[PDB]
Amino acid sequence: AVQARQLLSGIVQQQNNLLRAIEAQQHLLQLTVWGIKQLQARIRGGWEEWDKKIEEYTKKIEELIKKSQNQQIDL
Amino acid sequence: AVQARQLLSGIVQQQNNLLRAIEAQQHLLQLTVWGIKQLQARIGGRGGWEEWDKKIEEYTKKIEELIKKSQNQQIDL
Amino acid sequence: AVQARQLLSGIVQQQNNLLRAIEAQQHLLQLTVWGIKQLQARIGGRGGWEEWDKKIEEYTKKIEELIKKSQNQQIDL
């Protein structure tokens, strides 16, 4: 009882740590994407599909993140 | 009992969402790697980046291993 | 009882896998940051990317803090 409570709370707490890390990593990722796009632009045709997949994965990540924020509990 | 199941399942669901996000972030990261690599090629060659290339291969392999590892461990309650 | 332990241990092992993947992705991410910065420096100066650099740093430190914070909370059953 006291055991299981401390265990599950600890588990729940680290889930919030992992999620917060994932969100920060995503913010970092979007910054790198911008940097690349700006470099391709200083030297963007032929990168249409590349742009599309990025948008695809980015949308999915943002969806999953939002879906995780609501699933999240702070015990 | 009812409390335990709901709390546990909720935790299991949360983990599957975190994993899915990690996978999509990995797919996203590999796209940026290529993007950089193609820029480096467009500007002596890609010489001097052999070690850089190495660590990427190292971490990429490790991530993919850990992901597959997490897929086989993951449960869909 | 036997059910709960096996289920809770499985969950904890999964968290360990997810965390390790996040650390490896972070290593990979920092490699991409370097690659970009070196291309920016090889093509006026890196002026105008001050704010960009600052946010990279901001999120990077936050990630590393969150990672270390998760390594402590981490248990191996």
Residue numbers in the entry:
A (entry chain B): 538 to 580, 625 to 656
B (entry chain C), C (entry chain A): 538 to 580, 623 to 656
Authors' description from the paper:
HIV entry into a host cell requires a critical membrane fusion process mediated by HIV envelope glycoprotein (Env) transmembrane subunit gp41, a direct target of HIV fusion inhibitors that are usually adopted to treat the AIDS patients without response to other antiretroviral therapeutics. Most of HIV fusion inhibitors against gp41 are peptides derived from the helical C-terminal heptad repeat (CHR) of gp41, including a number of currently experimental drugs and T20 (Enfuvirtide, Fuzeon), the first and only gp41-targeting anti-HIV agent approved by the U.S. FDA. These CHR-like peptidic inhibitors in helical form are capable to specifically bind to the homotrimeric gp41 N-terminal heptad repeat (NHR), interfering the formation of a NHR-CHR six-helix bundle (6-HB), which has been proved to be the key step leading to the virus and cell membrane fusion. Finally, by introducing an innovative C-terminal tail of Ile-Asp-Leu (IDL), we succeeded to increase the anti-HIV potency of a CHR-derived peptide (Trp628~Gln653, named CP) by more than 100-fold. Unexpectedly, the crystal structures of CP-IDL in complex with NHR helices at different lengths (N36: Ser546~Leu581, and N43: Val539~Leu581) show that IDL tail is capable to bear two different conformations: a part of an α-helix (with N36) or a hook-like structure (with N43).
Therefore, we further determined the crystal structure of N43-L6-CP-IDL, where N43 (Val539~Leu581) is 7-residue longer at N-terminus than N36, and contains whole target of NTHP. In the final model, although the CP portion still folds into an α-helix, the IDL tail adopts a totally different conformation, forming a hook-like structure packing against the N-terminal hydrophobic pocket (NTHP), just as we designed it to. The side chain orientations of both the isoleucine and leucine residues in IDL tail are toward the NHR trimer, possessing hydrophobic interactions with conserved hydrophobic residues in NTHP, including Leu545 and Val549 from the NHR helix within the same fusion peptide, and Leu544 and Ile548 from an adjacent NHR helix. The hydrophilic aspartic acid residue in IDL tail also forms an interaction with NHR by contributing its side chain oxygen atom to form a salt bridge (3.2 Å) with the side chain nitrogen atom of Asn553. Besides the three tail residues themselves, their conformational changes also influence the side chain orientation of Gln653, the very residue prior to the IDL tail, resulting in a hydrogen bond (3.1 Å) with the main chain oxygen atom of Gln649, further stabilizing the hook-like IDL tail. As a consequence, in the structure of N43-L6-CP-IDL, binding of one CP-IDL leads to a buried surface area of 1115~1159 Å2, where IDL hook-like tail contributes 158~165 Å2 (approximately 13.9~14.4%), larger than the contribution of helical IDL tails in the structure of N36-L6-CP-IDL.
